[PDB]
Enzyme design. Sequence first.
Site, PDB file in Angstrom:
ATOM      1  N   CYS A  78       0.842  -1.222   0.000  1.00 40.54           N
ATOM      2  CA  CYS A  78       0.000   0.000   0.000  1.00 40.54           C
ATOM      3  C   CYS A  78       0.872   1.265   0.000  1.00 40.54           C
ATOM      4  O   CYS A  78       1.426   1.615  -1.022  1.00 40.54           O
ATOM      5  CB  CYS A  78      -1.019  -0.013   1.140  1.00 40.54           C
ATOM      6  SG  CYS A  78      -2.310   1.241   0.832  1.00 40.54           S
ATOM      7  N   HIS A 165      -3.499  -5.385   1.133  1.00 39.22           N
ATOM      8  CA  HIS A 165      -2.817  -5.851   2.308  1.00 39.22           C
ATOM      9  C   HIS A 165      -2.878  -7.385   2.383  1.00 39.22           C
ATOM     10  O   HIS A 165      -3.814  -7.950   2.935  1.00 39.22           O
ATOM     11  CB  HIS A 165      -3.489  -5.258   3.538  1.00 39.22           C
ATOM     12  CG  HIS A 165      -3.218  -3.816   3.707  1.00 39.22           C
ATOM     13  ND1 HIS A 165      -2.105  -3.340   4.366  1.00 39.22           N
ATOM     14  CD2 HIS A 165      -3.921  -2.734   3.311  1.00 39.22           C
ATOM     15  CE1 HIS A 165      -2.107  -2.017   4.307  1.00 39.22           C
ATOM     16  NE2 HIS A 165      -3.221  -1.631   3.712  1.00 39.22           N
ATOM     17  N   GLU A 167      -1.274  -9.149   4.400  1.00 35.55           N
ATOM     18  CA  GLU A 167      -1.151  -9.495   5.810  1.00 35.55           C
ATOM     19  C   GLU A 167      -2.503  -9.535   6.534  1.00 35.55           C
ATOM     20  O   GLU A 167      -2.605 -10.006   7.667  1.00 35.55           O
ATOM     21  CB  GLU A 167      -0.167  -8.479   6.469  1.00 35.55           C
ATOM     22  CG  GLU A 167      -0.701  -7.052   6.637  1.00 35.55           C
ATOM     23  CD  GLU A 167      -0.520  -6.109   5.498  1.00 35.55           C
ATOM     24  OE1 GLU A 167      -0.534  -6.577   4.359  1.00 35.55           O
ATOM     25  OE2 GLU A 167      -0.482  -4.899   5.776  1.00 35.55           O
TER      26      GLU A 167
END
Length: 188
Positions: A78, A165, A167
């Site tokens: 990002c 993202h 994660e």
Amino acid sequence: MIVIMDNGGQYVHRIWRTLRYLGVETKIIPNTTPLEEIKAMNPKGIIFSGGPSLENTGNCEKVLEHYDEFNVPILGICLGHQLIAKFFGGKVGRGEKAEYSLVEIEIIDEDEIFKGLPKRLKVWESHMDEVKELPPKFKILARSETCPIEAMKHEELPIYGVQFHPEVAHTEKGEEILRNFAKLCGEL
């Protein structure tokens, strides 16, 4: 050792915990950590984390300026994607949907970080900002309906960006994308 440079975002610990779950040696450091100190860690890979502001990227650009001292894979997430884009001569600007949501992306070049993954994935992301002009020497790896550049790589160097993202668990195959990136740091 994968070094995660902390640009202040809310999900930075999830990057670390994901990698730990995967059995990957990893450390989060302040983005302002001096380069020599980053070098003393013998990083096999570097991640530029998300965060609120291009004005708070610490030594992320300095790492790129001195890439020849590192010569390892880099993944920007990002804000990290966006700062890589700017540094390499692309342009970043506001997108059309500032709230986070799951967005469907289409993988157009599986390359390395999307190896073995389905062609469409729902990913956790916002487009408050996004890459508007791809840098010279980069290629697009994935897109969505409102953003042509959801993921990119340097055509010659192992320097990667994703707008979303991986994660965040909501992201489909997010852990796999991180795994694929880690596996790149273990082989050369």
